Structures are given as structure tokens and as C-alpha cells.
């Protein structure tokens, strides 16, 4: 996940 | 009779929620969903209308960056499409100056934008203005004294502590003093002559630190940190207090909403969102 947003990928 | 609106966001997938918080009584109201789910969008208000700008739909079937501008009227509880921007802009920042919306930065796939465009509601038209000196996605934007500021973000290679200001009558951007901390995904707002930058991600951790830029002194000074570290938070100002909404802390999609009182230099928890989420768009307007 993207550490800034939490979103998958 | 003013509410804090939160639009979109992410939790498992990008969301279409529109919910409004009333600081006067602590209530939340669920209102008409966005027509298309989106996270990494920005919200703003012009002439009583709420706008949702940019973002990306990160769905089970794929990722679609958005060039959309959608208009919500609280008097009818209806979303209407408005003119789309020149390009998709995920993790955009927006600011309103003299009735016009400035859309700044953001990404389209691997493209990290330095471009900036301006919307005129009276003509339902966007036009490109001078680009920023730096490409910025996850950029925080705020307006103070009819000047537009773009703070932090990520340029495609590095997360940034830099910031810059746009002077509309000269159609020119100039660097300002950099922040004391690298922040991409911070919440940026204006309160009493200062531009605040709260949270974000410095390359290693989601931050709880908060710093403010005094436009008269050109310095950045830390204030009290938030209780929760958060990145991709929503932020707004209402009756002289800053409100931060949600975000990601490296573990949880926060439902926390904290409120900063500048007179006491303290943060307090004021309500929880109905469910945890990151990447929301936030703005303040009349009750629906
Ligand atoms: C978005 C799904 C997710 C979140 C996080 C937190 C960063 N980690 C992972 N893992 C470790 C990878 C994985 O198995 O993802 C499957 C979707 N996933």
C-alpha cells in the first residue's frame, strides 16, 4: 500500500 | 447554520459518500452520493455551492484518474456535472480566489503535474494559468490575502518541504521559505494570517506535527502536534478553529476528527466520522 494514503498498490 | 462537508475518500475502495458535520450539535448527516467514487479529490465552496474536484476512482476494476468538477447544491441535495479540467488530477490541491477555483498539480498515471488551471463559475469554463515552479502531487493548497499557496507534495522523485506562491495579477509563481519538515499528503489551510501545514508523510512516517507560515515574517513555526499522526487527511477552518478529518496513520483509516484552538495552542477530539477513511475532500457551506 501507498504509505501516504493507505490505498492498495 | 454552517456545516463541514466531507466528500469521497477511501476505505477498501474509493468512496462516493457525502456527509456533513454540524459543530453546533455534533450531528452527522448523510447526503446525496457523488455520481462517481473518488479519493484524492479536493473540495471547495463558491457562492454557496460545493464543488468536488479531481481525484481518482481506485475501484476493484481499476484506477481511473479524474478531471471532473461536480457541483452540489445544498438547497436541492443534488450533484450536477460541471465543465471538466484540461487533465486528470489525482491528489490535487484547490484554492478559491475572487469567485474562481484554482486547481493545482496532481497526477495522471505516472505524470506529476506542475500545471495549474482556473475555473470561472459564471462561464462554466476552465483555463490554464502559469504552471508551478515544481511538479506537485499530494500538495496542500490554501489562499491568504488573495494569494494562492502550494505546499509540499511529491514531484515524481522526492517528497518536498518546499512551498510557493502564485500572484494572480502577475500570473507568476515564486518560491517561499521551505517548511521545516518534508510533507507530502499534509492538510493545509489558513487561519489568522498564517498558512498551516498539518500531518502528511515525510518519507518514513505519517506525521502528527503542525507548522504555520506567517506571511509577514516569512518563517515557519511548529505549534502543538495533533493527537493522531495522519496523512491524506481532510482539513478546513470553521469559526476560527482548524478541523482535521480522517487520514491514514500507517495502521488504521482514521475516523478521528480533531479541532485546533489557536488561542490555547491545543488540539481536542470533537467527533468521529461515521467510518474511517483517507483522501477526502472537505469544505464548509450552509445546511442542506
Ligand atoms: C491495500 C491492501 C494491502 C494493504 C497493506 C498495508 C500497506 N499491505 C498489503 N499487503 C502487505 C500486500 C498484499 O497482500 O496486498 C493484497 C491486496 N495489502
Numbering used by the authors:
A (entry chain E): 2, 4 to 11
B (entry chain A): 325 to 612
The paper states:
The transcription factor Nuclear Factor Erythroid-2-related factor (Nrf2) protects the cells against oxidative stress by regulating the transcription of more than 200 genes containing the antioxidant response element (ARE). Nrf2 is negatively regulated by the protein–protein interaction (PPI) with the E3 ligase Kelch-like EH-associated protein 1 (Keap1), which as part of a Cullin3-RBX1 complex binds Nrf2 in the cytosol, promoting its ubiquitination and proteasomal degradation. Nrf2 interacts with Keap1 via two conserved motifs in the Nrf2-ECH homology domain 2 (Neh2), namely DLG and ETGE. Unlike the DLG, the ETGE motif binds strongly to Keap1 (KD ∼ 5 nM) through H-bonds, electrostatic and van der Waals interactions.
Pleasingly, an X-ray structure of P8-F revealed identical binding of the ETGE motif to Keap1 as compared with P3-F, confirming the design hypothesis. Different from the larger P3-F macrocycle, the staple in P8-F is in closer proximity to Keap1, and a hydrogen bond between the thioether and the phenol oxygen of Tyr334 of 3.4 Å can be observed. However, shortening of the peptide on its own (P8-F) or combining peptide shortening with the cell penetrant staple G (P8-G) did not lead to any activity in the qPCR assay.
